[PDB]
Amino acid sequence: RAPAFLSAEEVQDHLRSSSLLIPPLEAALANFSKGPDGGVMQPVRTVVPVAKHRGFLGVMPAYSAAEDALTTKLVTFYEPSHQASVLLFDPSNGSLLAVMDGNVITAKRTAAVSAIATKLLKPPGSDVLCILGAGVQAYSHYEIFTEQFSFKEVRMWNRTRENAEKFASTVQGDVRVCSSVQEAVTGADVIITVTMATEPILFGEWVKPGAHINAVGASRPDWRELDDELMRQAVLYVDSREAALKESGDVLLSGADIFAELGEVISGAKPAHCEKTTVFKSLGMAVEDLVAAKLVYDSWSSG
C-alpha cells in the first residue's frame, strides 16, 4: 500500500504547538543520553558525496523503543540549499506509512531543543535575547523563544544588515538591529548563533558572565562560530558527545571539555550550571526528527 505524502504545509499545520513538541523532545534527549539503558538506536549518519554537482546526501535512521517509532531522515545539502524528507515506518511490521517534508520539522525541532536548553541554562535575570543570523533558524527560534520566555529586549545582528532589518519588520515584536556581533551580544543574557560563518564571530571577551549561548551553526569540523576563550571558559553542553567530537569545529579546534549532554541534565544525572557562562552546541539528532515526525503523523492521521 502506498504511503501518505505530507507536504511542508500539511506538516506545519500539525506542528503549531511547541508545548506539544517540547515534552517528547525532553524524553527523547534523556533517553538517548541513557544510551544502552535508554532504548534509542541512533547510528552514525552516512553521507554520500555527489562531487560532480557539489552535493551531499545524508541519511539518519532512528528507532525509539519508548515511543515505539521508526524513522529515517534523508537530507541533501548543495553548495533551498538544505532539503529534507522524513520517512515514518510501522515499527510492528516494517510498512512505510508516510513520506513527509523534513525542512519544517528541522526548523521547529532545532528551535525547540534550543528552548529546552535555555530553560535549563539561562542565567538569573534573563532580560536580553540576542540572535546572530537572520535565516530560517532565526525565525523558528524567534517564534518559540518569544512565546516560551519573556524577554525585555530582543536584538539581532546579521552578516548583511538589510536581512536583519527585513527580519525585524516582518516579525511581530520589536527587535533592535545591531551594527556588529559585539554590540548585539554585550549585555545579552541569552544568545542564539544561527549563522554560516566559518571563522569565529562571537568572542568570549564580549560575553556577559552567566550568559547562555545556543550555538546552532557551523556543523562541520573545520567551521567555527565561537572563539577559544568562550569555548574553554564556558560550561559546555551538547546534544551528542559522539557527534560533537566528530562534527563540531567549535569543540574540536578549541579542545574544549564537554561537561554534559542535555539529556543527562534533563534526567538529573548532570547539573544545570545556569549561573555560569554556558554554551549549548547543537548538531541535531535523528531521534529529535523522529519525535516531531511521529507527532505530525499521529495528528494528521487522526484529527
For residue 210, the minimal CB distance to K ion (Å) is 5
Partner touching 99 among K ion, its own copies, none, CB below 5 to 8 Å by kind? its own copies
For residue 14, the minimal CB distance to its own copies (Å) is 16
Partner touching 278 among K ion, its own copies, none, CB below 5 to 8 Å by kind? K ion
Torsion 9-13-16-21 (CA) sign: negative
Q: Where are the beta strands (DSSP E) in the chain?
A: 4-6, 40-41, 46-50, 55-64, 69-78, 82-89, 96-101, 128-132, 153-157, 176-177, 190-193, 212-215, 235-238, 260-261, 278-281
Partner touching 52 among its own copies, K ion, none, CB below 5 to 8 Å by kind? its own copies
Partner touching 5 among its own copies, K ion, none, CB below 5 to 8 Å by kind? its own copies
Closest CA to 110 of 145, 71, 80, 81: 145
User: Does the annotation place 193 within a ligand binding site?
Assistant: no
Smaller CB distance to K ion: residue 27 or 121? Answer: 121
Partner touching 135 among its own copies, K ion, none, CB below 5 to 8 Å by kind? none
Closest CA to 296 of 109, 62, 96, 54: 109
For residue 276, the minimal CB distance to K ion (Å) is 6
Smaller CB distance to its own copies: residue 168 or 243? Answer: 243
For residue 124, the minimal CB distance to K ion (Å) is 9
User: Does the annotation place 196 within a ligand binding site?
Assistant: yes
User: Does the annotation place 60 within a ligand binding site?
Assistant: no
- Tell me whether strands 278-281 and 235-238 are parallel, antiparallel or unpaired: parallel
For residue 93, the minimal CB distance to its own copies (Å) is 7
Smaller CB distance to its own copies: residue 66 or 258? Answer: 66
Smaller CB distance to its own copies: residue 52 or 172? Answer: 52
Distance, CA of 33 to CA of 263 (rounded, Å): 5
Name 228's Cβ contacts closer than 8 Å, sequence gap at least 6: 204, 254
CB 226 within 8 A of CB 185: no
For residue 90, the minimal CB distance to its own copies (Å) is 9
User: Does the annotation place 214 within a ligand binding site?
Assistant: no
Name 63's Cβ contacts closer than 8 Å, sequence gap at least 6: 40, 41, 42, 69, 70, 71, 91, 290
Q: Is 282 helix (H, G, I), strand (E, B) or coil?
A: coil
| Residue matched to cell numbers 544525572 | 269
- Rounded to 10°, the helix 18-34/136-148 angle is 100
**Site of interaction with its own copies (CB under 8 A):** 1-3, 5, 7, 41-44, 46-53, 55, 57, 59, 61-63, 65, 68, 70, 72, 74, 76-78, 83, 85, 87, 89, 91-96, 99
For residue 264, the minimal CB distance to K ion (Å) is 16
Partner touching 240 among its own copies, K ion, none, CB below 5 to 8 Å by kind? none
Extract the C-alpha cell encoding 301.
Answer: 492521521
User: Does the annotation place 194 within a ligand binding site?
Assistant: no
> Binding site for NADPH, residues?
81-82, 109, 134, 136-137, 158-160, 163, 195-196, 216, 282
> Binding site, residues?
45, 81-82, 109, 134, 136-137, 158-160, 163, 195-196, 216, 247, 282
> Binding site for 3,3',5-triiodo-L-thyronine, residues?
45, 247
